[PDB]
Amino acid sequence: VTIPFLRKYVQYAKERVIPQLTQEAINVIVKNYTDLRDDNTKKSPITARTLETLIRLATAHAKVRLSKTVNKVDAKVAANLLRFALL
């Protein structure tokens, strides 16, 4: 919450835990990427690099909770961040 706590939180997550993928978070991000590849006809271009950035963030959330592997909710909060930053 305070200033000297989140620094220790971020460095312990950076040094100890590395997250890996699961089958529960591959399909929902495949569904989200194929559904957006809508935005091309309406408001924004979607590239191949964005595929990589759509799981980077998931991993991020999965390491914010410092779990050893990813979850479906990490891809869901990445899609929510995408809906706020794209629309």
Partner 1 sequence: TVYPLRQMLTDFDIRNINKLSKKKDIFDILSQSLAPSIYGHDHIKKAILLMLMGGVEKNLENGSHLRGDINILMVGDPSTAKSQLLRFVLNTASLAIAT
Partner 2 sequence: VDYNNLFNEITDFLVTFKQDKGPKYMAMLQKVANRELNSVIIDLDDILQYQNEKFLQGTQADDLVSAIQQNANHFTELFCRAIDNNMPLPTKLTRRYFLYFKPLSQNCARRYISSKPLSVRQIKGDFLGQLITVRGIITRVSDVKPAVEVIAYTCDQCGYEVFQEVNSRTFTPLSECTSEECSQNQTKGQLFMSTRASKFSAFQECKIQELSQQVPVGHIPRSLNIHVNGTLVRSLSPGDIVDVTGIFLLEAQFVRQHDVEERVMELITSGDVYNRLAKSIAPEIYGNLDVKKALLLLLVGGVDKRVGDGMKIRGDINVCLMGDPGVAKSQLLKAICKISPRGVYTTGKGSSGVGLTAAVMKDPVTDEMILEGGALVLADNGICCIDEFDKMDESDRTAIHEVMEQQTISISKAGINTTLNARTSILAAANPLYGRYNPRLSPLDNINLPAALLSRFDILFLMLDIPSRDDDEKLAEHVTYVHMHNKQPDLDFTPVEPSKMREYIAYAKTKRPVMSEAVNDYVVQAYIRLRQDSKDSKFSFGQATPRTLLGIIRLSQALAKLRLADMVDIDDVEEALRLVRVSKESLYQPTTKIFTIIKKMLQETGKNTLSYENIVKTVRLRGFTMLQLSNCIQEYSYLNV
Q: What is the Cα 4 distance to its own chain's centre?
A: 26
Per-residue mark of binding to partner 2, 36-75 (x: CB under 8 A)? -xx-xx---xxxx--xx--x--------------------
Nearest residue (CB) to partner 1, 36 versus 62? 62
Among 3, 5, 16, 34, binds partner 2 (CB under 8 A): 34
What does 37 interact with, of partner 1, partner 2, none (CB < 5 to 8 A by kind)? Answer: partner 2
Residues 61 and 31: their CA atoms lie apart, in Å, by 19
Residues 83 and 85: their CA atoms lie apart, in Å, by 6
